[PDB]
């Protein structure tokens, strides 16, 4: 209990002269509590259960009726040198490596690229399972974005972001905020469950770090009662995730034109909402307005550093997205 009391120092999180005892629930108003986050763990499991049903009785018949092959990817032709290079050298050879392999094996570069793509597909799961997972993600993201838009349409701090900090932290918790935060955290914990235990042959990369950062931000902004700006960030980030899954579903259905159009639109929305609106609208209120309304307290630095890390990760993702979308634009012409 000593270590927990040291971690939850009231002079670190809350502003000056504000104590946790002032945020206790009474009959006058209710405030967010850390214990309310425990409920995110059972519901997450329930969500996972529902996901299985969605992949069993709903997404699978739709994929079958879409002429999606239920078997595994086509087996790449055997090659000792190619297999050794793939296992040891790299999985995505560069132009120089491809030229060297072509010269060594007296084979066309296109054949080597096709073999590498086939090997990568063989390592990756089957197409139908990915289609079902993308369908589930698309449904959830569409519902969450719609709910977030409907909820923020009436809130007073959407139009004037300074209302996020005027009465902070003495801002009562409503049912809509609680439901929104619990739903988001439950979905992220469901993703963590599907990543850790469902199949441990998956990859821990940048996406895993981004998920960890998102979970940390949601948890410690709900605990600290920074939910008004959290909802803005959540809606802004979930705006562009409803088109990526649709583009993936179109790609897995062998619809070239539809997938290209959907991905171009997704890239436009992603760039607009995570490089032009985020730093001028969300990073404005959490850096400048918060400084002049609330004041400098230690948790401000931590949260702003995490937001800058999120901005950097979004820059990296946007770079990859535009690099891929240039090929789609070229093909569309």
């Amino acid at each position: 209990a000593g270590i927990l009391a040291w971690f939850w120092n009231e002079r670190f999180w809350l502003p000056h002269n504000v104590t946790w005892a002032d945020l206790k629930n009474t009959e006058e108003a209710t405030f967010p509590q850390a214990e309310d986050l425990y409920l995110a763990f059972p519901l997450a499991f329930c969500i996972f259960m529902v996901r299985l049903i969605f992949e069993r009785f709903v997404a699978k018949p739709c994929a079958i009726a879409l002429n999606i092959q239920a078997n595994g990817p086509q087996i790449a032709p055997p090659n000792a040198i190619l297999e050794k290079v793939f296992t040891a050298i790299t999985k995505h050879p560069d132009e120089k490596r491809l030229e060297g392999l072509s010269k060594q094996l007296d084979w066309d570069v296109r054949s080597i690229q096709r073999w590498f793509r086939q090997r990568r597909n063989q390592e990756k799961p089957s197409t139908l399972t990915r289609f079902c997972e993308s369908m589930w993600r698309f449904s959830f993201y569409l519902y969450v974005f719609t709910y977030g838009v409907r909820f923020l349409k009436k809130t007073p701090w959407l139009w004037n972001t300074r209302h996020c900090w005027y009465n902070y932290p003495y801002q009562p918790l409503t049912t809509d905020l609680h439901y929104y935060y619990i739903l988001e955290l439950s979905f992220y914990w469901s993703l963590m469950f599907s990543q850790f235990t469902d199949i441990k042959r998956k990859d821990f990369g940048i996406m895993f770090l981004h998920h960890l950062v998102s979970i940390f931000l949601i948890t410690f902004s709900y605990v600290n009662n920074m939910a008004r700006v959290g909802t803005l960030v959540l809606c802004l980030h979930d705006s562009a995730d409803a088109l990526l899954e649709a583009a993936k579903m179109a790609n897995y259905a062998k619809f070239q034109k539809m997938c290209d159009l959907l991905f171009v639109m997704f890239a436009v929305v992603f760039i607009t909402t995570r490089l032009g609106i985020f730093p001028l609208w969300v990073l404005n209120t959490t850096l400048f307005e918060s400084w002049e309304i609330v004041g400098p307290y230690p948790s401000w630095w931590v949260f702003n550093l995490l937001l800058l890390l999120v901005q950097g990760l979004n820059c990296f993702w946007s770079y990859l997205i535009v690099k891929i979308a240039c090929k789609a634009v070229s093909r569309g012409k």
Partner: nanobody
Amino acid sequence: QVQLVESGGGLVQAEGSLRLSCAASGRTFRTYGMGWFRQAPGKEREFVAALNWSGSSTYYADSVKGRFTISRDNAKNTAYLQMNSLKPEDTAVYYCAALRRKAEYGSRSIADFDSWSKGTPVTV
């Protein structure tokens, strides 16, 4: 959930200066935003000034802006309103109130302030 008592009222000369005080009997005065209201003969109550719990943000009314300054001291659990260059239109009864934990900042309505006070008469 605070009891507010006002002081500093009285008669003042034209273009004078006055300083109303509103003291709170409680330890929760620092978690509520203070505000002041005016009651002139006839008409109805009018909004004068208000501020949030920390005192960083402060907003007045259009007719009184530039002359009245409202601040607060959480150490002494009190709020102050300094009025400079008074006018005959300022002769009225002043009431001290607090935001009711659910009214948003910038409210200028009677229903948004709960803990009222007796008020003090000011004549110019």
